Amino acid sequence: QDPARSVRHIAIPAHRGLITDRNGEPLAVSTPVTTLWANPKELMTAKERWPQLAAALGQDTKLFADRIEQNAEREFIYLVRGLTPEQGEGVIALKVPGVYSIEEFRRFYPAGEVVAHAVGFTDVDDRGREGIELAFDEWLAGVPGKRQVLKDRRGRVIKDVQVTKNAKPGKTLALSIDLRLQYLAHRELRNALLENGAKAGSLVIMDVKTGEILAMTNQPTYNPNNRRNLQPAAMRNRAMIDVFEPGSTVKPFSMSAALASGRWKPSDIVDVYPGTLQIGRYTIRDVSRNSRQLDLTGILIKSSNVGISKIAFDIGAESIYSVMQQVGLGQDTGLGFPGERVGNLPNHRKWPKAETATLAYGYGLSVTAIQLAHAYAALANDGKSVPLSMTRVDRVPDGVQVISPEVASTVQGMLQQVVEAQGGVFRAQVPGYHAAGKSGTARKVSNAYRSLFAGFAPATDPRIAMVVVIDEFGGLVSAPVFSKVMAGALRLMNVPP
Template sequence: MTGLEGALYPWRFRLVLALLALMVGAISWRIIDLHVIDHDFLQAHGDARSMRHIPIPAHRGLITDRNGEPLAVSTPVITLWANGKELAKARDQWPTLAAALGQEPKGFTQRLEQASEREFMYLVRGLTPEQGEQVLALKVPGVYSLEEFRRFYPAGEVAAHVIGFTDVDDRGREGVELAFDEWLAGVAGKRQVLKDRRGRLIKDVQVSQNAKAGKTLALSIDLRLQYLAHRELRNALIENGAKAGSLVMIDVKTGEVLAMVNQPTYNPNNRRNLQPAAMRNRAMIDVFEPGSTVKPLSMSAALKTGRWKPTDQVEVWPGSLQIGRYTIKDVSKTQGRVLDLTGILINSSNVGMSKVAFDIGGEAIHDLMSNVGFGQDTGLGFPGERVGTLPSHREWRQAETATLSYGYGLSVTAIQLAHAYATLANNGKVLPLSMTRVDNKPEGAQVLPEDVAKTMQGMLQQVIEAPRGVFRAQVPGYHVSGKSGTARKASVGTKGYTANAYRSMFAGFAPSSNPRIAMVVVIDEPSKAGYFGGLVSAPVFSKVMAGSLRLMNITPDNLPPPVDPNAVQPQTADAGGSKGGRI
């Protein structure tokens, strides 16, 4: 029956044979195509299953001070990782591995058991190359290594708040490391390798992309001045039993930040027991009422109007002034009935400053404070930087005008206050601040007439050198200009001020004849000898300024006149003992 059907329908048989022939031909052609003509296809898929790209870590950029001294460097380290499935087969070697890694055996065993089904887990990161080689020499199955870089900070706690630090993945997390992360971070490269199905390295094929190192960053900080400021601020906190402190130093001519230190501080190379409070860059984060340190700005606003001259006098008797329910008081009770404008600064008279402010109005003072940077970002780009507050009113009442004139009702940071004094010292020209080294002097904006700024420089020199001046801020061999300030600390969470809690401040610049350095010292809650800025902060200013002027080779402007060897010397008693001679 079957043979009869085949004879009756021969076309079916031929059709089947033809189809089979086409199928064999198609398969044969595909084999030839893949192996001879289009062999890259199979090669690509084969490589995809065995070819891998291992990242080549990039060297993070070097951070130096203005003179090339290293502040942050990257050193090569070894990171050990493991394939949990492979390591599970070598359980008998776990105690040896734990001992080599310096880890507690029980906890290490539990960790490996939890990761027994994973193909990747970190064992330890950041070993020195020598330590990593010692562990790898044990040849424990499933233990592999990666090359990485770890950040090291030669200056340690001295520059911690400025430099910041990186995390375990070498990404910036604080300070300059975070603010300039894109500049410092390099671009990782790629290495092409062959691995077997278990992920073991068979062959290092080639470097497909070279790693690109990060760029070097030269800061404006002078490490010598940074060490000096750090030491003196730390000693001041110990001597005065203070809670915290900040010091900022600015180059008057360029706007560069030469030093910025805070206490308490921390060691970025060892952050195991790091306290969050120690990480605060208080010079840029903590805001406070600046108190009497802003009186020179208020007085400059008065001089700018042309309505006042330094010799003009104001009655300050009896040392208090009633404005509604608000009473303005002077600390000093022996300043006299009448003071000129310089005397108001020397005696830090709130009453005298308020009366001058009433005459020119609060808006004039507000505008000048705004022009020197209060209530604004400094432009340094630091993470967490605060701008403070500078109140503005449609109608300035007497109470608001008075409090603003002598430093209450507004808040600033130490860096803003230092910037304002640098502007006074730079003859009224405000320069942009810079945390990186400035090679070309920037253009500034004239926010205060030059003659007014120079007049204020002389008045602030008298604040230091007058008989009732802040003598503790004097610097041997130099004329110094500045103003002390003391402000009560606002309470946190409630209105008003905290009892017996003060900030002691001093702001100034030197040399007075040609200012080069502006500096602000803020000490938080001194608790021993006293709390006035002239008593607590002025000595720190004096010591740091004296050392800084010498280190920067700035010519003294207050040396005693040279002795003429030809001049007639006063007669003294001779060896024979002349009668009537006096020594």
């Protein structure tokens, strides 16, 4: 026969670490719940109690009985996971032979759908499945404790002996996210999509000094506290996953290369008439074909593919490739979100004219909204790249001077004119401030199109970079979202006009 006595162990679940926004507002909080397990060999001696027990578990009387009878020979099954402590005390109070309790934890997300994708959620075992919860699982999970029990020959717990290992609570995490900006971003992105008959999009706000992600919102979203009817479209962290050719939004990086080459100055003129350029069997065609001479700022205002291609042929694709690589386009973000997409910044030894031109006007690479906001942050931060962070930054990293301060300042002033000049993206203007940026028609890589707006403010002393992505010309839907969210974000951060 089996031993009359055996010393056994039971795990002591650990309290998962608090997630807060950068101002300490809670975003994910461990809620005590009660798990009930049974020894069927003991339960089998108390059948008349089963229907009361089943009703207190919210289980069907016969399905409950069938489950215990089917497991009669086992000494452990779970009865139910994650009752309220009040509910568990009610079941324990029934004193049914063979019913035992374990203290577990369930997450609650106080801000719900507003920050669903960035924070993520946990599975039935309280482990990270999505977002920060996944990326920082090890940090947040802590370490289960251990205690000894004495069991008899039939698996009855006859003594709680001792705790041999204290549970180690998980560690607290303060995100870079500012929930005030996050609520503004979520509201305005949602409202823009509903008003324009669009289904999906994303918005990223970054601190250009610190590399902090201040807001990251995607539509559709979901309530992480009630996933009962959750659609896969809604769980997608689009800002980090959706890859697209960024089109005209990377022409500022092409212009940065041109101004670093020694061959170009802002007052330089390019003739783009008649809005096309034959390069062998290929024709580069401009979206607006009403121009002859354009200065470098006008090439950005008109988004002339011919203009930027002629510059690119003069300076060589390798100069443009290098800037785009150094500002992080097509590169690992280092954020350690499993499944984050890197996109592709193709390289060549010999760049033919076609591939040189498509790189320079943004169809020769694929990026995410995070990478595009990161690149805009570098340009805004007087050309100094700072690592991306989803966590609060107290000591700002040195970062890397990727674009000379002078060139970055000149390109800031060109992008100010894109927003402010006659013929510019006037819907991206931010009353009280100089804003700077560039619209684009992005092409999805998996043709599906996205309306992009990328920019920063204040134009003459930048603090915040922003990318707006609307899945669906001239930012007519993404530019006004930038305008409204930047207007708000700057004042919530007490940025002076």
